[PDB]
Write a protein that binds this DNA or RNA. Structure first.
Ligand SMILES: [Zn+2]
Ligand SMILES: [Zn+2]
Lengths: 72, 195, 930, 195
RNA sequence: AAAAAUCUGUGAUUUUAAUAGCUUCUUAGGAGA
RNA sequence: UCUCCUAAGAAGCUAUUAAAAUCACAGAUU
């Protein structure tokens, strides 16, 4: 189950980079910190919280229309 | 299939040679005709060195070229739809992770409460939410505390779309804002902070 | 106990004392010595039994006794030596001599009382700072505490600060040591004064460090023999040669600096256009090292051979910490182009070597060809001279200019996710809870500032001296390893380029790659190289980030050395490089193949011949950043030693100033700014691996010489090494020109035991354990001590291993574990990677194209070749790491064949003509050829 | 295949043999002349084959020479282009050397030589300064004028990492730059200018 | 905008060596017109 | 005086296998 988070975080970071988050020199550093902490950890308890923190930023950058599809 | 006929003629020549050599038991002394048959069969066989070689080379070249074309046509199609592919992959992966936390977060996001989309998120201790309707407001907040994610946040200031700033209502239990929902317009912008 | 003896020892000093011995009996203490006589030789640590010691005490203002460090030592000797020392002290009464006092306490006891000596002499300080181990460190803490070198000291300070001994993790370290500078400066000056006094009074004898009390006063005269007044021969050949590294580890000569620098307010007023400091290094040398009995040429132009060059560069490295930093680098001159003035180089001024002037000079140019235009453009002297000044406080390195485009930030990208294989692996059961193959080796991004944050790690490179005697003998022994290789210069037509489509550095990279610049007619490449032997051609260097799988989170960088460097360094070095690559069964492993039964040959050749073997290994923390400059120069000279006939000495000096100006002191161009590289090897420089290997051999030989010199030769059981050790000290210190008849003997001893296997930075050695137990060979703890003062790093034991049981093979060499498996009915070693790396190089890919599995089928065929030996592994969870790859290649081929039918074609011939998804193709890659 | 002259001779020999073997049947088999005709045809075929092989082997030399000359032409063209580009770059970077300052910098030199590191320090008029932290800005900027070494500088602009621009805030004593806010991304690249 | 080297696979061109075969001149052995 | 078969030398042409060299792509290590 840990590998699932460690593999979802990389694709999430790829999506955020494709969304042109590198323009901000403050948000990018915080996101990189979260991503590195998720990758370098072992306890899924911390990885899940850090992944949720990363995901909170996704809505702010771009209100993805697909937000209503994952529910079902 | 154009190469098979050469194989058929070679086999026919070999069979004829076998038949003539088996029937011609006297060929041991009269080996002239036996040698002639052997040489004719050999000439029939020799066609392979040319026909099979050319066929194999041409087929290999054509297959290489066509495979390269197919690989290019596949990689270009893969690259054509990058961002939508990334979204689909991310959602398919999130579906795999069984965690009620992310499900609750996504349900709340679909409800109508999301970051303000401006003043980008920069720290782990601040947010800015929008609460569309009184129903989700009552569902989420409780007096001074709100729970957007699994964590509990503390409210600092509340603003209305017109810019007027709201204030809490005195009550024995504690500060409250619910009554103001039915008397003021929507939506409300709430500046949170980590607890 | 007796009180009369103490009362007499008190003398007229009028000071309080407390006995340490139980009476007239002597006292036993552990002190370092420097002995060389008809029976022993070395820098050993032996017990002292000839002297009784009393401690002075004083009354503090608070009314409590303070146990000051002033000691009274009362040595006891025979009447003959008593009279001899009395007569000697009749002279040499100057202020630099500790106040003696001669008396006889009883009819049979003779005393030579020395008053107010400090506890530890100079030799104890030098020895403790040299042979440093973090579990017997009292001799150094008791010196640092007393002389107030830790300003915030409070009881049990060392308990809270657990990493006070780490040069690269305690930012205050060097600022903690620098407060010892005055003591060493005083020691040197008092040594010179005492030498002059001895010469005047006419005494011939040997002076060493243990003679000098820490206050700086000499305190015993047993060995001196009188001679005619006005004619004396003091010898300090081993006083200076042992403390040489500590004069620059503690910044002894700081009060001599010619400039005052504040990190925020810049240099104070000083002479800005003076470059020739040749007339001041000589004065400093005569002021401090007056009794050094060898010549010293400030400029390395005049040096006679590649040994005097090292000897003088060692001094220049110390004396160049005082010259202002805005005075080194390229010189320049004013010339004209059709009447339009501009700047062009006219020499070079290097920290380690000295001033060199070009042998050709011109003051006009027109119709310039391609070679001259390239020389002008690539030379920084015209770019740095026409751009805005730069001052950035992010880095400690000097910053000389900023390009027109300004400073710009560059980031790194994350790695893609190859789900098409992750799902298959999960279906096969690779990833499950409690697995023995956790995921590691991810793709790590970096923020904006990484480009310079990583380059800032050059602050670990500091100017370090070497003790020239030991370093020179170690160089002579090391050069014996490279005695069976070809060497020389080759013409242009014979050069060979591995790959031609690669960047040509700055600014050439704008117009094309190396292919475009290699089209120059050979008559022009030859002219360029020949004119490099009579000129100095400085060039710019880029610093570009790297992007590859890595477990460590830190970033990486590689230097893109410009084409004007490689184009000539290839012609210079390629012959010996290709001779190193085409040799087998030698300490240098570069060029040997891991497949086809090569690994077993290397391992069974390393182990053969050594009695009672016990392998080991070592790791250099930050080798690229922290490599001292003098060792890089030594490696370059060791590789250039083979030009006996093709080049004269002067050309071999100009070539070394070209290598130094192009690699060791680059004008780095990192992130829109031009800096000055302090030192250390650049990864992208030509012949980096071979220079690293030579440096490794030098370090491994020093780690053995130092340990072999520091043992009590009186108590060596073996009668063959008991004489080799005695001869080694005399051959190293008490002689000027090395003796090959002994260098060969010592190299034979060092190759019979302590075998070696080296590849750039990696290494392994199987050393005779019985000797290493007695201290006659450099075991693991014998490398940390040498790295402490020859590399300025602490080699933590967590980075080293030891494998006494040979049958299990090396723990890890070249990042591949070794295992023993029967092949063809005999036991042979096989390598096998870390399965996490193989498993996590298929899931993550560095480009979007590679995520399409069908298009890169060859990636898994090349990955399954290297992961085969995991089939023999006992752990059942590692065989899947290979069978899954086989099944995946089968699946890829089947999918491609089925999918290609949409084009109305059948690939059945090639499909069934594939042997790659079977075990036979790979199993034959680890079997010795017939 | 028919281009080589020997093919015509081979065809002529074939025709002659075919005609003679049929014309000589009047006298019977006549092995004496039949063997001579066979040998003549055999020699003709051997000579034709040898000449064809020699010509085919010699053919490739023309293609090799054409490739060589084409490569030479392309390499000389690329060399010309590269030389033009290098000349343009050199004459572009050499156009902004103020001869006036260079005429005084070398006046004070030790025999007309000055280390390269001190050309921009005595000739330039703008200092690009980079500040990575407020703890350094407070200790370096010193209001609006930055003093480095001995000279006194001014400030022309202040640019942050994002690429935006900070602006001064007027006060009673004079202009100042607002620092230590949470909305400025470090480092700050300050472009000074000599007084 | 992506450095200096070593090793190993796959595909394309050329030469060499061997195997099999074809055509030809010569010599030698067996016999035939 | 000529002809068939057989052995060898030599010349040319076909293919199959193995090695070397050049060119292109891809992995691993320092
Ligand atoms: Zn010298
Ligand atoms: Zn040479």
């Amino acid at each position: 189950k840990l590998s699932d988070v460690k593999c979802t975080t990389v694709v999430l970071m790829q999506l955020l980079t494709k969304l042109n988050v590198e323009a901000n020199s403050k948000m990018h550093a915080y996101l990189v910190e979260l991503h590195n902490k998720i990758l370098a950890s072992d306890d899924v308890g911390e990885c899940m919280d850090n992944l949720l923190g990363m995901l909170i930023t996704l809505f702010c950058i771009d209100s993805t229309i697909d937000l209503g599809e994952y529910c079902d | 299939f154009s190469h098979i006929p050469s194989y058929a003629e070679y086999e026919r020549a070999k069979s004829i040679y076998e038949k003539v050599l088996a029937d011609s038991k006297n060929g041991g002394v009269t080996q002239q005709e036996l040698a002639a048959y052997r040489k004719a069969a050999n000439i029939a066989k020799s066609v392979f060195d040319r026909d099979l070689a050319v066929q194999k080379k041409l087929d290999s070249m054509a297959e290489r070229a066509m495979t390269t074309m197919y690989k290019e046509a596949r990689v270009t199609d893969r690259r054509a739809k990058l961002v939508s592919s990334l979204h689909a992959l991310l959602f398919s992966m999130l579906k795999k992770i069984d965690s009620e936390k992310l499900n609750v977060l996504f349900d709340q996001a679909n409800s109508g409460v999301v970051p303000l989309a401006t003043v980008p998120i920069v720290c782990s201790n601040k947010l800015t939410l929008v609460i569309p309707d009184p129903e989700t407001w009552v569902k989420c907040v409780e007096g001074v505390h709100v729970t957007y994610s699994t964590v509990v946040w503390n409210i600092d200031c509340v603003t209305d779309a017109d810019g007027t700033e709201l204030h809490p209502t005195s009550t024995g239990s504690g500060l409250t804002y619910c009554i103001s929902g039915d008397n003021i317009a929507w939506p409300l912008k709430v500046n949170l902070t980590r607890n | 106990f007796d009180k009369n003896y103490l009362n007499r020892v008190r003398g007229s000093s009028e000071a309080r004392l407390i006995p340490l011995a139980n009476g007239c009996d002597p006292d036993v203490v552990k002190r370092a010595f420097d002995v060389c006589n008809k029976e022993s030789a070395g820098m050993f640590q032996n017990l002292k039994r000839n002297c009784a010691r009393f401690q002075e005490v004083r009354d503090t203002e608070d009314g409590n006794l303070e146990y000051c460090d002033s000691y009274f030592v009362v040595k006891q000797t025979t009447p003959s030596n008593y009279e001899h020392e009395k007569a000697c002290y009749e002279d040499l009464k100057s202020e630099v001599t500790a106040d003696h006092d001669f008396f006889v306490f009883n009819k049979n006891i003779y005393n030579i009382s020395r008053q107010r000596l400090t506890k530890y002499t100079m030799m104890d300080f030098c020895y403790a700072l040299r042979h440093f181990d973090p579990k017997d460190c009292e001799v150094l803490k008791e010196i640092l505490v007393t002389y107030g070198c830790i300003e915030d000291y409070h009881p049990k300070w060392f308990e809270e600060n657990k990493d006070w001994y780490d040069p690269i993790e305690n930012p205050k370290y060097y600022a903690m040591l620098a407060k010892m500078g005055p003591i060493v400066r005083r020691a040197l000056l008092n040594a010179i004064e005492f030498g002059n006094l001895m010469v005047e009074k006419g005494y011939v004898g040997v002076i060493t460090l243990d003679n000098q009390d820490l206050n700086g006063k000499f305190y015993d005269f047993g060995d001196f023999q009188k001679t005619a007044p006005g004619a004396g021969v003091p010898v300090f050949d081993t006083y200076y040669s042992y403390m040489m590294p500590i004069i620059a580890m503690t910044d002894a000569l700081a009060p001599e600096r010619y400039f005052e620098y504040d990190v925020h307010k810049g240099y104070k007023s000083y002479d800005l256009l003076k470059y020739d400091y040749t007339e001041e290094k000589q004065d400093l040398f005569q002021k401090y090292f007056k009794y050094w009995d060898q010549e010293y040429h400030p400029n390395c132009r005049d040096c006679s051979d590649d040994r005097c060059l090292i000897h003088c560069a060692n001094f220049n490295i110390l004396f160049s910490t005082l010259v202002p930093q805005t005075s080194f680098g390229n010189l320049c001159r004013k010339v004209f182009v059709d009447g339009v003035p501009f700047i062009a180089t006219c020499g070079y001024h290097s920290k380690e070597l000295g001033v060199i002037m070009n042998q050709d000079n011109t003051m006009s140019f027109s119709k310039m060809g391609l070679s001259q235009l390239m020389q002008f453009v690539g030379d920084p002297a015209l770019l740095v001279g026409t751009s805005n000044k730069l001052v950035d406080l992010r880095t400690s390195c000097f910053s000389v200019c900023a390009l027109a485009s300004g400073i710009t930030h560059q980031t790194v990208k994350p790695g893609h996710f190859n789900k098409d294989f992750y799902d298959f692996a999960e279906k096969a059961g690779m990833f499950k809870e409690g697995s023995s193959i956790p995921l590691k080796h991810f793709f790590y991004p970096q923020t904006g500032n990484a480009a310079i944050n990583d380059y800032d790690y050059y602050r670990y490179n500091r100017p370090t001296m070497f003790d020239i005697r030991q370093l020179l003998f170690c160089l002579e022994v090391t050069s014996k390893y490279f005695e069976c290789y070809e060497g020389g210069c080759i013409p242009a037509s014979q050069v060979v380029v591995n790959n031609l489509d690669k960047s040509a550095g700055y600014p050439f990279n704008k117009f094309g790659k190396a292919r475009l610049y290699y089209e120059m007619s050979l008559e022009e490449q030859d002219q360029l190289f020949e004119s490099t032997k009579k000129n100095v051609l400085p060039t710019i260097t880029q610093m570009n980030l790297k992007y590859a799988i890595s477990a460590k989170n830190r970033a990486r960088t590689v230097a893109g050395v410009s084409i004007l460097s490689t184009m000539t360094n290839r012609q210079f070095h390629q012959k010996i490089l290709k001779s190193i690559v085409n040799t087998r069964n030698a300490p240098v492993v570069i060029g040997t193949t891991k497949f086809y039964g090569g690994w077993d040959n290397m391992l069974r050749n390393l182990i053969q011949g050594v009695e009672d073997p016990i392998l080991m290994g070592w790791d250099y923390p930050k080798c690229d950043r922290a490599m001292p400059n003098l060792l890089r120069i030594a490696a370059s000279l060791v590789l250039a030693r083979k030009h006996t006939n093709c080049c004269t000495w002067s050309e071999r000096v100009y070539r070394l100033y070209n290598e130094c100006a192009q690699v060791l002191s680059e004008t780095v161009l990192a992130t829109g700014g031009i800096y000055v590289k302090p030192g250390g090897t650049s990864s992208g420089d030509a012949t980096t691996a071979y220079a690293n290997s030579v440096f490794n051999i030098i370090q491994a030989t020093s780690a053995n010489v130092a340990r072999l010199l520091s043992v009590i030769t009186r108590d060596i059981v073996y009668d063959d090494i008991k004489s080799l050790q005695y001869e080694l000290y005399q051959q190293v210190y008490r002689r000027v020109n090395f003796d090959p008849a002994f260098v060969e003997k010592f190299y034979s001893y060092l190759c019979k035991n302590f075998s070696l296997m080296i590849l750039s930075d990696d290494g392994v050695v199987c050393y005779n354990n019985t000797l290493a137990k007695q201290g006659l060979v450099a075991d693991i703890s014998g490398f940390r001590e040498v790295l402490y003062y020859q590399n300025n790093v602490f080699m933590a034991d967590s980075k080293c291993w030891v494998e006494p049981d040979l049958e299990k093979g090396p723990h890890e060499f070249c990042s591949q574990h070794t295992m023993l498996v029967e092949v063809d009915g005999e036991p042979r070693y096989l390598p096998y990677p870390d399965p996490s790396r193989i498993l996590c190089a298929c899931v993550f890919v560095d480009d979007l194209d590679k995520t399409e599995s069908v298009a890169v089928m060859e990636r898994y065929i090349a990955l399954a070749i290297d992961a085969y030996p995991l089939v023999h592994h006992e752990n059942e969870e590692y065989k899947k790491v290979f069978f899954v790859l086989l099944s995946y290649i089968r699946k890829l081929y089947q999918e491609l064949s089925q999918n290609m039918l949409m084009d109305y074609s059948f690939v059945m011939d090639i499909d069934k003509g594939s042997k790659f998804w079977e075990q036979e193709f790979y199993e034959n890659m680890y079997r010795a050829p017939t």
